[PDB]
Design an enzyme around this catalytic site. Structure first.
Site, PDB file in Angstrom:
ATOM      1  CG  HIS A  85      -5.955   2.814   1.332  1.00 28.24           C
ATOM      2  ND1 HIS A  85      -6.516   3.425   0.226  1.00 28.24           N
ATOM      3  CD2 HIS A  85      -4.773   2.257   0.972  1.00 28.24           C
ATOM      4  CE1 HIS A  85      -5.624   3.280  -0.748  1.00 28.24           C
ATOM      5  NE2 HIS A  85      -4.548   2.626  -0.333  1.00 28.24           N
ATOM      6  CG  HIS A  87       1.161  -3.722  -2.181  1.00 31.30           C
ATOM      7  ND1 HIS A  87      -0.210  -3.651  -2.363  1.00 31.30           N
ATOM      8  CD2 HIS A  87       1.618  -2.513  -1.780  1.00 31.30           C
ATOM      9  CE1 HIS A  87      -0.530  -2.381  -2.142  1.00 31.30           C
ATOM     10  NE2 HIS A  87       0.537  -1.660  -1.795  1.00 31.30           N
TER      11      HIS A  87
HETATM   12  C1  LIG Z   1      -0.926   2.387   2.543  1.00 31.41           C
HETATM   13  C2  LIG Z   1       0.204   1.585   1.891  1.00 31.41           C
HETATM   14  O1  LIG Z   1      -0.162   0.227   1.692  1.00 31.41           O
HETATM   15  C3  LIG Z   1       0.557   2.106   0.467  1.00 31.41           C
HETATM   16  N1  LIG Z   1       0.879   3.502   0.448  1.00 31.41           N
HETATM   17  C4  LIG Z   1       2.186   3.934   0.640  1.00 31.41           C
HETATM   18  O2  LIG Z   1       3.079   3.118   0.862  1.00 31.41           O
HETATM   19  C5  LIG Z   1       2.417   5.402   0.583  1.00 31.41           C
HETATM   20  C6  LIG Z   1       3.731   5.850   0.590  1.00 31.41           C
HETATM   21  C7  LIG Z   1       3.994   7.217   0.568  1.00 31.41           C
HETATM   22  C8  LIG Z   1       2.977   8.180   0.514  1.00 31.41           C
HETATM   23  C9  LIG Z   1       3.270   9.645   0.619  1.00 31.41           C
HETATM   24  C10 LIG Z   1       2.299  10.599   1.000  1.00 31.41           C
HETATM   25  C11 LIG Z   1       2.557  11.958   0.902  1.00 31.41           C
HETATM   26  C12 LIG Z   1       3.777  12.401   0.429  1.00 31.41           C
HETATM   27  C13 LIG Z   1       4.751  11.492   0.071  1.00 31.41           C
HETATM   28  C14 LIG Z   1       4.515  10.143   0.163  1.00 31.41           C
HETATM   29  C15 LIG Z   1       1.657   7.700   0.500  1.00 31.41           C
HETATM   30  C16 LIG Z   1       1.398   6.338   0.536  1.00 31.41           C
HETATM   31  C17 LIG Z   1      -0.565   1.841  -0.499  1.00 31.41           C
HETATM   32  O3  LIG Z   1      -1.647   2.423  -0.472  1.00 31.41           O
HETATM   33  N2  LIG Z   1      -0.300   0.879  -1.478  1.00 31.41           N
HETATM   34  O4  LIG Z   1      -1.296   0.816  -2.370  1.00 31.41           O
HETATM   35 ZN   LIG Z   2      -3.171   1.657  -1.538  1.00 31.61          ZN
END
Ligand SMILES: C[C@@H](O)[C@H](NC(=O)c1ccc(-c2ccccc2)cc1)C(=O)NO
Ligand SMILES: [Zn+2]
Length: 301
Positions: free
Chosen positions: A239, A266
């Site tokens: 991912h 990011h």
């Molecule tokens: C993996 C990381 O780089 C980021 N994702 C997140 O920061 C993120 C934050 C919170 C949740 C989350 C999941 C379930 C419930 C609440 C928040 C999911 C992904 C992402 O995918 N950016 O595109």
């Molecule tokens: Zn992502």
């Protein structure tokens, strides 16, 4: 004699979902666009309609997701949809949104790749422009690093570093060389993920309102909470590769080169793009009038 052409959508395609961060319902419409338009987001809920080209210069916030900004108008979480666009080689498109955030769908680029391929691709009567890395360009911040390396093709390497029981062994690093590996099969299905202690903090602040096990991998102190498990043995690092491909596509053209990320996110991805753009000796624009001589291969439209 077969040139690598710019691509757009053959038909309009529609999707509905919810924003991961905002929790708001949003209507998504992808439309064909003329040669050299690039990817342009359009907030169709506003008067007048506000267009934001998906370019590095328009990135405004980089905490948790990549956000595009024009004045006070925002388009949040563009990375997974841009990763799908980059994976399928879409050069030109209009992305209409009824709200300030792209729908999270299932947390991966899978639903977007399928919606795009369902609509079909259209080759346009103009050469596809690529940005070729000629010299190494790197950015660092603390122990995080992101690098562009000259490479005859397109390759993404990524390493994560979580001191956690789920995150041990060889599954913390992955390299994908798109001359032999399929973006659709091996990267597109990789979902976003969050740790329960971070999620609890975000919920305490009335943040990440749309997130759940339906659109993200949720990991507590010892395990994956999603009942049905993982799509890949190394879904987490895949991912991060998906995120990097999407953030990289804010260059506005497909890359001929290699990206290496170490704990990059990011913010650092966007700093790498800004450093590359500013270092004009490190890159050049190239076209392929003969597809046989090209180092990057795209699927038939
Ligand atoms: C993996 C990381 O780089 C980021 N994702 C997140 O920061 C993120 C934050 C919170 C949740 C989350 C999941 C379930 C419930 C609440 C928040 C999911 C992904 C992402 O995918 N950016 O595109
Ligand atoms: Zn992502």
């Amino acid at each position: 004699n077969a040139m690598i052409k710019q691509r757009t959508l053959k038909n309009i395609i529609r999707a509905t979902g919810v924003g991961l961060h905002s929790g708001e319902k949003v209507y998504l419409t992808l439309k064909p666009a003329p040669v050299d338009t690039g990817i342009v987001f359009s907030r169709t809920d506003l008067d007048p309609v506000v267009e934001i080209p998906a370019r590095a210069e328009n990135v405004g916030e980089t905490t948790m997701s990549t956000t595009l900004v024009k004045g006070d108008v925002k388009v949040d979480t563009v990375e997974h949809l841009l990763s799908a666009m980059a994976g399928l080689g879409i050069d030109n498109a209009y992305v209409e949104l009824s709200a300030s955030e792209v729908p999270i769908m299932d947390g991966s680029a899978g639903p977007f790749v399928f919606l795009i391929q369902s609509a079909g691709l259209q080759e346009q009567e103009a050469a596809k422009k690529f940005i070729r890395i000629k010299r190494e360009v790197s950015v660092e911040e603390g122990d995080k690093r992101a690098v562009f390396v000259p490479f005859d093709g397109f390759k993404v390497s990524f390493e994560i570093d979580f001191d956690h029981p789920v995150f041990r062994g060889r599954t913390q690093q992955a390299s994908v060389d798109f001359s032999s590996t399929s973006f659709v099969k091996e990267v597109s299905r990789a979902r976003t993920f969050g740790f329960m202690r971070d999620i609890e903090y975000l919920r305490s602040q009335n943040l990440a309102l749309g997130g759940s096990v339906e659109n993200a991998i949720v990991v507590d102190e010892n395990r994956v909470l999603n009942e049905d498990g993982l799509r890949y043995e190394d879904e987490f690092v895949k991912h991060k590769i998906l995120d990097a491909i999407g953030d990289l596509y804010l260059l506005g053209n497909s890359l001929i080169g290699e990206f290496r990320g170490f704990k990059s996110g990011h913010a650092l991805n966007n700093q790498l793009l800004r450093t590359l753009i500013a270092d004009k000796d490190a890159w050049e624009v190239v076209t392929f009038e003969d597809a046989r001589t090209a180092p990057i291969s795209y699927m038939r439209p």
